């Protein structure tokens, strides 16, 4: 059936080439480019004493959770730089952290292969482990809450999982990646999510159906980062091959490539602005590069980190970008 | 600041105090990455020192060791090998009696050792090499020659010289002046590997301090 699979791939790529009526690069020639994004670090969040691997913004656009290898999960009041909580993780080898859209839970995980859910709002004043989601046989690289009771986690066991937090059970398993799955991105309607993995492919998953709707293969190296466009009809990846690609769900094709000659290091994190015209990618060359998502031009550079920028996020109100990094510092930019 | 903002700032300051205390207590730990290939004697030396990552805590002669057994991560190491970028030493386990086995076990061990020595995150990380099952290797070396694994040996067929050649093959993968490989031969029964790890870690710290001063 290998010949049938190869024929199906060939005819699918022929169908994709059929839809290539006009590249996104051509359409946006006659539109005004953003001049030059020059953002400035507004807050610097200090208190992580090791490498920060993940941060997530709260939906209130003021609280953010960060995960670092010092075994502490810190929730920051990014307006005042106050530390709302310092959550000591049972396993210090955290690789991902999520903040619930409600704000009542944070999740984290890593080399322990467990998604630990933390109840931020308990009757007692402590943040305690609400649930430990065991069942992944590889490290957890990403996790995102659907709501207070559902969280989707990607793993190094090449499979993503949808969890019922209350019962601690894998509601759905998202198999189909051949390499380590490195990132997740929920669509704004949370009816479907993309996941980029180490097979240099990003697969579009239906949360309810539990099956891969589409597979996107433009990258050459391991995809470390993925993020939907704000409207949910597109997403952008970030891989080790020093390029970001914008894939459209409906067009089922890569629309734009965000690469520059002097950039050779991999991309650890990608995110969009509120309008989505800016693609903010964090690179291993210690800085975050802002790209005009409609023209693939480096609008700006977020220099200011002294190590690999591992994580970055944009607030839901789009006011600020926070970039974590391996230098143990979180910086809010605006 | 408001009164509630004042109390929130005070709580944040207490949180920073606790984070500082924890980081101070954590910087005094010697972080060891236990690494190897399956049937190698990783479990034996862990049992001597005494999910997805197993962490072994043991204090030996006033020095605290955090030994990270990551053997349950059957995934791409390079996607998490950077989490151990700051370990004092990598404890690499090799089954000496793996030249005559296939899964070639010893060639796989050499390939893993090379990929770990020349990993970018481990350029200056020394390695406490353990040549395990030396009794089994001695039993198998008088019958099975060291030619199943190494065809270009062109040497004798005794236990000592064959094991020295194996250790030399492993040490030849270093290709760096700023790290050392502290090869030790273990028989899965001697209660000394803790002292060997301690001595190698002591030597690594001393050599690092000498390097800082320009004395190394």
């Amino acid at each position: 059936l290998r010949q049938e699979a190869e024929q199906l791939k060939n005819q699918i790529r022929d169908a994709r080439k059929a839809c290539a009526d006009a590249t996104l690069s051509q359409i946006t020639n006659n539109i005004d480019p953003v001049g030059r994004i020059q953002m400035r670090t507004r807050r610097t969040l200090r208190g992580h004493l090791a490498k920060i691997y993940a941060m997530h913004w709260g939906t209130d656009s003021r609280l953010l959770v960060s995960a670092s290898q010092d075994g502490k999960l810190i929730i920051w009041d990014s307006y005042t730089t106050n530390k709302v909580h310092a959550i000591p993780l049972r396993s210090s080898w955290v690789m991902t952290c999520a903040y619930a859209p409600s704000g009542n839970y944070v999740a984290c995980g890593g080399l322990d292969n467990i998604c630990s859910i933390y109840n931020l709002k308990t009757r007692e004043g402590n943040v305690r482990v609400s649930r430990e989601l065991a069942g992944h046989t590889g490290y957890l690289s990403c996790c995102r809450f659907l709501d207070d009771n559902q969280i989707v986690t990607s793993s190094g066991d090449t499979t993503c999982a949808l969890w019922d937090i209350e019962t601690g059970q894998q509601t759905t398993t998202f198999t189909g990646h051949t390499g380590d799955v490195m990132s997740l991105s929920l669509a704004p309607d949370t009816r479907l999510f993309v996941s980029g993995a180490c097979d240099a492919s990003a697969k579009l998953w239906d949360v309810r159906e539990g099956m891969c709707r589409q597979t996107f293969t433009g990258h050459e190296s391991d995809i470390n980062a993925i993020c939907f466009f704000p409207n949910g009809n597109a997403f952008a990846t970030g891989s080790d091959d020093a390029t970001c690609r914008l894939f459209d769900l409906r067009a089922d094709q890569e629309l734009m490539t965000y690469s520059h000659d002097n950039i050779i290091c991999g991309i650890t994190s990608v995110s969009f602005s509120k309008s989505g015209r800016l693609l903010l990618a964090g690179y291993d060359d210690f800085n975050c590069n802002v790209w005009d998502a409609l023209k693939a031009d480096r609008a700006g550079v977020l220099a200011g980190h002294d190590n690999r920028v591992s994580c970055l996020g944009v607030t839901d109100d789009g006011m600020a970008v926070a970039t974590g990094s391996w230098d143990s510092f979180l910086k809010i930019w605006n | 600041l408001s009164a509630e903002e004042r109390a929130a700032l005070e709580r944040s300051k207490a949180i920073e105090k606790n984070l500082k205390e924890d980081g101070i207590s954590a910087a005094k730990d010697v972080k060891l990455l236990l690494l190897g290939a399956g049937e190698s004697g990783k479990n034996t030396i862990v049992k001597q020192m005494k999910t997805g990552i197993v962490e072994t805590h043991f204090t030996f002669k006033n020095l605290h060791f955090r030994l990270f057994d990551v053997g349950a991560q059957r995934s791409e190491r390079k996607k998490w090998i950077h989490c151990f970028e700051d370990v004092t030493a990598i404890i690499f386990c090799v089954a000496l009696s793996g030249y005559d086995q296939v899964l070639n076990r010893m060639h796989a061990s050499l390939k893993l050792f090379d990929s770990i020595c020349n990993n970018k995150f481990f350029i200056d990380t020394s390695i406490i090499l353990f040549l395990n099952k030396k009794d089994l290797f001695g039993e198998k070396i008088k019958k099975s020659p060291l030619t199943i694994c190494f065809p270009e040996y062109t040497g004798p067929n005794t236990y000592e010289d064959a094991a020295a050649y194996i250790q030399a093959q492993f040490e030849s993968k270093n290709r760096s002046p700023n790290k050392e490989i502290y090869c030790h031969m273990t028989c899965s029964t001697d209660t000394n590997n803790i002292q060997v790890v301690f001595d190698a870690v002591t030597d690594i710290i001393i050599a690092n301090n000498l390097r800082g001063c320009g004395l190394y």
Partner: single-chain antibody, 232 residues
Framework: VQLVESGGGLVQPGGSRKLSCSAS????????MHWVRQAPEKGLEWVAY????????YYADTVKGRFTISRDDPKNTLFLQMTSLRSEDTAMYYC??????????????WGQGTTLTVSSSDIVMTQATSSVPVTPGESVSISCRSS???????????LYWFLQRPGQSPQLLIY???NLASGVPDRFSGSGSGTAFTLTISRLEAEDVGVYYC?????????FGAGTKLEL
């Protein structure tokens, strides 16, 4: 979550007495803890505040010097050392949980209190109405006014609403003006602005019958408005 105050009883005027509240079932060391007293027929009056970790301590000017608040975190006990107990120190003393981070809910839990009987620029919170008679199923609004604007430059208005039910400890209803407390049914609403505030009950039950108190948490000499007792 429990807070069991201990002490009280008859004390001769000018004497001394130690009030202890044994916290149970919560992370007592991470909570700022208060003493709030209430004279046998008067409203609530905040006595003292010891922060989490004993870092910051405040007293009411009517007890400052005579009173000393302390906490025993390993034993989860909050103390009030009272000296020179005047006749106006005759009140039920409630120990109050309070935790302060962004979005927290201070004053959420109150202890059962102890009756202490003494033998023979503060913001003025003035909820002027009192003894409001209401019927079940009706919607009642409870007014509150502040001498100074409780709204802070940060956007937060530090007005609290409590429910002294008959024979029961106060219970937080609305912690920061228009913020509904946990476990409080969403028939209470917080409204108002600046210096004037209103607490609305959409459809009051027999559970809602009690005395409703304002409290400001802007400047630390916390003050209450004399309770607007709701009666059937």
């Amino acid at each position: 979550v429990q807070l069991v105050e201990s002490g009280g009883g008859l004390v001769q005027p000018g004497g001394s007495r130690k009030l202890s509240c044994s916290a149970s079932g919560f992370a007592f060391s991470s909570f700022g803890m208060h003493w709030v007293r209430q004279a046998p027929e008067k409203g609530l009056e905040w006595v003292a505040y010891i922060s989490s970790g004993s870092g910051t301590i405040y007293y009411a000017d009517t007890v400052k010097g005579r009173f000393t608040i302390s906490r025993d975190d390993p034993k989860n006990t909050l103390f009030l050392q009272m000296t020179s107990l005047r006749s106006e120190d005759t009140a039920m003393y409630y120990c109050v949980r309070s935790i302060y981070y962004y979005g927290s809910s201070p004053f959420d839990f109150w202890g059962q209190g102890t009756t202490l009987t003494v033998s023979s620029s503060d913001i003025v919170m003035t909820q002027a109405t009192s003894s409001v008679p209401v019927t079940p199923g009706e919607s009642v609004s409870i007014s509150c006014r502040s001498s100074k604007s409780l709204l802070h430059s940060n956007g937060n208005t530090y007005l609290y609403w409590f429910l002294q039910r008959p024979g029961q400890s106060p219970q937080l209803l609305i912690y920061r003006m228009s913020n509904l407390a946990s476990g409080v049914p969403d028939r209470f609403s917080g409204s108002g602005s600046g210096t004037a505030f209103t607490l609305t009950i959409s459809r009051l039950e027999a559970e809602d019958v009690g005395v409703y108190y304002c409290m400001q948490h802007l400047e630390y000499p916390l003050t209450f408005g004399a309770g607007t007792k709701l009666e059937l």
